């Protein structure tokens, strides 16, 4: 019941990935009140930090001490570009969870071709995870286009955060 | 991360299926009765309708607002032909359930084919609720066959109403 | 105390109406949140939708039941084209329901001919129900004129879901 | 929808498997506590015996009900030796439970092969019950390297048994 | 106060009786749903199997912890045949319930010849059991001489399992 | 009142020891566990990283958003080696905090040259923090010297995890 080595890899570069987004999520979450006036924004984004800096990783770490698989830290992260406005900052973020959702879908080929039905059933949560968390960060990037009032948005914002699917939750 | 169009298909078609079932299954509730005299197995008939008609194809339509995918609706059914014995309406719901069954794998399958693993994780939702489904309507049939009386199977299917499964709930 | 014919025919096609239209609804909900980003109009649509083809198309299966009047299932929907906007697909519904009205309308007037009384009493709710979700729709599509912001009119009909008249209730 | 003979067959060696390690188990917690005098691994022991002749039993004959599937009870286990300390009673249980994850992915890749998705569904449990009794196992087995003493042992082992991941659970 | 060899082999083979019927009444309380349509009477033939797989089996490793006394587990069994109709299940449970009676008195005769007067405590339980759970098979057996129609017969099974005599309690 | 941007570097290069601190501190969390059989130290562990890539960094983002100051997100680090013991992975962590004490002493000393009592006042938890966070590892440091057995120190550290100074608090 040995290892795959390049599941292991895959798994160690996701734990980068999570690792490293929240760290630039929790600076866009600072730029998104202090430069954008949007605390709510924020809000959104300082969550979305601590998930990815949090149970994305920590599941990997544990499956790890459970299969015999090696965990790596090698992280590398700077934020040296902002986005102009909030919209477009949101929509990095979009853009960085569509990335995830690709990623993750890399890691299930994987381990369908080397048969790892382990491998395959832990990755079923960041399958859904995937989709779920872009689906949140779309129904914010949705309100940029809905009205021209920040605080109306941040608003509707504020609601959402202060709010689980069957099938996606 | 672009969508499938195979499987929009495939699932535009599934939400096509729930729908026309459950009005079919809506007039056999009908049919139970006030042709054959057995209310409660109209309820349990039209509470498959009203599953039908409800998160099976709402399911699908989330998944589509998520996703990228079109709903499509085009709803043709007709009912022209009633069994002619309480027996053959529950057997006749059986038919369809393991159809339904066959249908839900070819998804699957496809879903393993065109590399959408998030698909394959919204089916599996499907895979399970069709096997569970036809085991519900299994256990109905099961009574025309082990009494003769429909006052005695009728107060069998009262209490199966009246009533998950770690696996198939 | 025998059944007219000419009422049957007349339930059968409210049936089919109310069958037809909340599949409409369930299309024109799903594209409410979807392509117009305004999931709480989409709510609205969707809790039309199901009392469509819910309590308006049981009643009239149940009174069949009762007096000896025949159920036919003949359905045909297909959603083709969607209106443009928001406004428009709320302005849509309207119309469908002030058609609602004028078929009700139709079947009291052929009661009262046919001397049915039974059948007066229960379209009476039909009558009342007419009225009552026009109501509600119209105070939605009133909001389309009083705001050009999407996100106000969202938050007006949050609260009007998260919500009975002693005659129209 | 008929049902893949391959998977009967490797779904009643399963039974078989799980019916007689629970009896192998039924015997090493006797010896844990009565040969060992250690009252508490064999409590540990005896409440993995019976989940193998439990839920892992039974869940493969209730899929067979729903199925089509055929039972098959031939059982034949005998404990001719036993270990000769307690440290290589857990190390036996270990190698157990590996194997059993190698023989539940065998079932997995079949019913990938046979295109049995309701099947790749039921053992999906099956797939992630396999790494967590071989966690606790290790877990246990972890502490015989840890002290010299059984009775700190015995008092690890008491609190771990009196005690669900998200994934793992 | 040195253990009698042959009540520890009495013993052994009271141990293996019951492992081994519990295992065939799990594959007949399988049998009873399954094909027969009954799923209360596999209910309580599962109840049956977990009782002899369970307290039966477990107070005699309890007690040879006590005295000295040692294992064996040696199990043999094989469900080759399957009776013909639930009667004949049934009938067969009470059999082999019948000669549980018979083999409980031999070990009574024998704590008695052996002067082991803590092996004729213990069997006490098991002389009580044993027409215990003869009296509540043959109930079940009864009701199939009582009626002809399975469902009543299920019906009467479900209360007496949703249901203790100050003797044989 | 316009902001120091010598305070602004040293606070900024508290965020990334903080940040990076805690990575470490993930990865010796995983490894009091997984290598060295220890689940409750690194529990220990993955609190103190929690810690500091929580409240330690966040708190000097709001204070940023407050003064004017500007956050800067640089984050290197990498795990390459890991210590030998477990008492040396305390040992470690150990030395890092002593470390943490020097430069949060460097901060306050400069808000007092550069007359920023704001700061000096934001930095007075940094100041209380490090003593404690220090006195609560060299707690655990301790035990590895007062006994050789590691489940009896594992039992100390559960007991201290499973658990505020007036001053210190
Ligand atoms: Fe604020
Ligand atoms: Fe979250
Ligand atoms: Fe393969
Ligand atoms: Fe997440
Ligand atoms: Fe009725
Ligand atoms: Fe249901
Ligand atoms: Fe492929
Ligand atoms: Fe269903
Ligand atoms: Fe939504
Ligand atoms: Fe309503
Ligand atoms: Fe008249
Ligand atoms: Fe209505
Ligand atoms: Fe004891
Ligand atoms: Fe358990
Ligand atoms: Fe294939
Ligand atoms: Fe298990
Ligand atoms: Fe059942
Ligand atoms: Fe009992
Ligand atoms: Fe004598
Ligand atoms: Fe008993
Ligand atoms: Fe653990
Ligand atoms: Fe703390
Ligand atoms: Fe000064
Ligand atoms: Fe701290």
Redesign the interface.
Do not use: C, P
């Given at each position: 019941?040995q290892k795959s080595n390049k599941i292991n890899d895959a798994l160690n570069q996701h734990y980068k990935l999570n690792?490293?987004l929240g760290?630039?999520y929790?600076?866009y979450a600072?730029?998104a009140?202090?430069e954008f006036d949007m605390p709510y924004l924020g809000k959104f984004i300082q969550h979305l930090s601590e998930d990815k800096?949090g149970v994305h990783?920590?599941?990997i770490?544990?499956?790890?001490?459970?299969?015999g698989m090696k965990?790596?830290?090698?992280?590398?992260?700077?934020?040296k570009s902002i986005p102009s406005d909030a919209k477009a900052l949101i929509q990095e973020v979009y853009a960085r969870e569509?990335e995830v959702?690709?990623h993750?879908?890399a890691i299930?080929?994987l381990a369908?071709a080397e048969?790892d039905?382990?491998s395959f059933?832990?990755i079923?949560?960041y399958?859904?995870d995937?989709?779920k968390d872009?689906?949140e960060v779309d129904?914010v990037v949705?309100?940029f286009?809905?009205?021209?009032?920040k605080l109306?948005?941040e608003?509707?914002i504020k609601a959402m955060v202060e709010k689980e699917?069957?099938?996606?939750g």
């Open positions: 019941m690792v490293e760290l630039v929790a600076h600072h730029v009140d202090d800096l990783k920590e599941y770490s544990d499956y790890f001490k459970r299969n965990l790596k830290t090698d992280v590398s992260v700077a934020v569509n959702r690709d993750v879908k299930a080929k369908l048969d039905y382990e059933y832990f079923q949560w399958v859904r995937g989709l872009l689906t129904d949705k309100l286009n809905s009205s021209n009032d109306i948005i608003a509707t699917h069957e099938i996606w």
